[PDB]
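Case study.
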Amino acid sequence: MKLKERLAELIPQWRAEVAEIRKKYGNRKTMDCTIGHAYGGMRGLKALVCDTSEVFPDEGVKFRGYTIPELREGPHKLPTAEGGFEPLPEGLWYLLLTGELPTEEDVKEISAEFTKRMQNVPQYVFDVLRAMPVDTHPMTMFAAGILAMQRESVFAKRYEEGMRREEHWEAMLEDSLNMLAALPVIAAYIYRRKYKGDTHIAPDPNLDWSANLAHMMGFDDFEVYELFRLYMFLHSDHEGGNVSAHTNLLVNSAYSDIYRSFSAAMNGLAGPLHGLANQEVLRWIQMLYKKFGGVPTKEQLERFAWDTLNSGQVIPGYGHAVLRVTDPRYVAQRDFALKHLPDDELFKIVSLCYEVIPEVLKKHGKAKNPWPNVDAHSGVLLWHYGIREYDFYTVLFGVSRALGCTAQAILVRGYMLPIERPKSITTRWVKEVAESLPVAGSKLAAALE
Amino acid sequence: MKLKERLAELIPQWRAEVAEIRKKYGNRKTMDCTIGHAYGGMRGLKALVCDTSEVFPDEGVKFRGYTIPELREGPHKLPTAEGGFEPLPEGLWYLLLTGELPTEEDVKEISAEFTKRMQNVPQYVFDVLRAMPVDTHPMTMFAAGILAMQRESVFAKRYEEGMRREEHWEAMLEDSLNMLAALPVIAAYIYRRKYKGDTHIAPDPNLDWSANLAHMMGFDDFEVYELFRLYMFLHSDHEGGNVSAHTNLLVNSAYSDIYRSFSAAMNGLAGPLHGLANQEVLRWIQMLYKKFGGVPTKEQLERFAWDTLNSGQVIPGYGHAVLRVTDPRYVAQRDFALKHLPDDELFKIVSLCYEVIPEVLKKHGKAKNPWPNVDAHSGVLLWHYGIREYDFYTVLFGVSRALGCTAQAILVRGYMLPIERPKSITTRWVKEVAESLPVAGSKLAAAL
Ligand SMILES: CC(C)(COP(=O)(O)OP(=O)(O)OC[C@H]1O[C@@H](n2cnc3c(N)ncnc32)[C@H](O)[C@@H]1OP(=O)(O)O)[C@@H](O)C(=O)NCCC(=O)NCCS
Ligand SMILES: O=C([O-])CC(=O)C(=O)O
Ligand SMILES: O=C([O-])CC(=O)C(=O)O
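After joint prediction, the assembly is written out as follows.
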């Protein structure tokens, strides 16, 4: 398989580069660590490595250096489905791992690997899923199915057998192919059992990864196939620091296999502060429609935007801290909506927000970012095509994010990064030692080296 | 319950006291964050808060300021079981939570709480356990059983209904009581199904928590009850930065409940670099035994030590990623072994390792810590009383670690710490800017 032959060349090299960097640049200072970091969820602390993707304040997220437009439309457009426009997540995955753009042949090889392996979900995984009460939250069901599949781990087996650290990345790759193939099967099972009368649809062997998930969920429509292709591409990866990504690396760093690390990641994504943003934006859009008996006027949205901001509150999916432009994941969803569902009423509200909400934020003068993120746009696309089960939105997110989490876990075992073991501190020590400590970026701080 | 009354007063205080520290002292610097930290698993980086315990390199772990000798033997001895010496983990949990030594009454109230709620493991949790193939790794089964019981989460439910941030710690304690009560039941089920012909033994309502685990595994001797008590006491907690404690805090920080954060932690504990040490040591000790036709001499082991080191191998059970002298968890086990099984052959090798192996590892000079950790001692004890199922040792570890993980997660939801979200950096950036960056502790850093 092309991907694997290539990685067999790239990874020894990267491994050697990282060993040198660590040796020659390890004592290089990047920032001050503070009391506020320790009590403040490490916000801003550069404590982690991720090479798959990278957020730039002025451009948004990039995937191995390429922008979304380059891959979606521009001169480096990733392969599509036949007749398709949207990039195949399969191709992105080739990109995230190798840093090179795939050939049509490269994508086809990965599609075949995915389709084949999708037929190989153990029967016992379904037994595990049916044993859970049907009212269990779907993200609990999703994490449990994944974890039960740990029995098939090639990594865990070869580790018990004795393998060289140099083989880690290969076992991780095999496990990743298996797991990613399985994910839309496990997710669809959950969807069907919970929401569609416990009728089960087999994988179509002539559909790509993304399309098989819509199909098995019971949505056979070309637009849906495209939406899901775009969705999975967009939400694939967003650095290493978000809870789900970090959970994955953290558990990976102890040599736990991908079924253990990613299911752990999903218990993190299941958290209300991490995995619910899409849903809240959608519920808000729906609350605007019902409030104004329809799409509001330009004037009503401004007034309801001013009331909300002036009353201490925020507008969901707008004005996150980091970026200084519109999230390029937002832009690609807008372009999908305009093309495919422009007259949908909830879309019209989101559209109206893109005009109105940035103007009111600039005039309100607090947020250096007046622009939306990805979660502003995703919920209405799902609801339009009939995916209306809020709780399940996080599962779709989860299936996407596996692309990035698997890429990253393959890479860092290729690099042989060590176990994550930070130092914790006590409130006692802080209180004993606080006064004694220099303020950061201060003359005293400069004094103490 | 005394515990909860006590927390109902202490938590609003600590919460106010933490908010004060973040405001007043947040911008105080502790250390240089370096490129090394990012590529080196954050080793040394002060990125986390934990008040349950603290590892002092030249003293070892302390539990709310109290040493292991203080709590087990010396001037602050925690409640034991009727007729017992070894401290009950129920009382240590009280300590961890409140910062205060419990009475007999305090401890008894918690035992009773564990014992009652131990009857309340849902039938569907056993359905899930039985749907996994019996050859599944025990730590996968454990994590999965815990995770299935997320459906009974009080915290997740109260969060959906709308609850005040102040109510969080209450819903976390409730969930923790339920989950701690269930773990011995889930673990014993795994044990009996995997290794003991799938015959199952019910909780005994008149035993304490640790002893019930032993009972439900099929071990009823008093000395085993005592071992489990000690074992659970020693493995309870070890700061906030080990992979299992950290995974628990991380997942907890996004408001995921203790069934989610602790099952995530167990997946981390399942990792060879975190949860496997006890077994490696036992195998190694048994390998010496077989090799020397019994207990070696000082000379034989001294030689063997050197030949292992100079062949680029690890001496398992010695050295740590933070500890710097003898692990006081090791000394507690040695005491137990001298007291209860001084003539066990494998123990005698462990003992002999204690004399010889430190001095050897000093001279070799690669190990930063030349002394033994806790995993040097735990295996021979388990093996001696007939717990011989290597892979299951990590589950025992996990049951015990739940004590600290639940304590930490209750407290932090009391303090209202926010989501954990560090920044990742790229190799590309590092290659772009590294030369231009100041060396940590330089004149250039002092100017910048
Ligand atoms: C716990 C442990 C993993 C910590 O590793 P660490 O933080 O990298 O350790 P150090 O800072 O002491 O490493 C410095 C050197 O000492 C070596 N070292 C430490 N203890 C050693 C031992 N018992 N035998 C051989 N070499 C040892 C390391 O391999 C390293 O050499 P390297 O640069 O060639 O890799 C390590 O002590 C170990 O492997 N112990 C044996 C297994 C064990 O008992 N684990 C239980 C841990 S709870
Ligand atoms: O929090 C982050 O860094 C990124 C993220 O989760 C998201 O895109 O939803
Ligand atoms: O703290 C560590 O790094 C490992 C350990 O001993 C423990 O978790 O008990």
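Observations recorded in class. The pocket of oxaloacetate ion (ligand 2) is lined by residues A 238-239, 241-242, 374 (CB under 6 Å). The longest helix of chain A spans residues 168-195. We will return to this complex in the next lecture.
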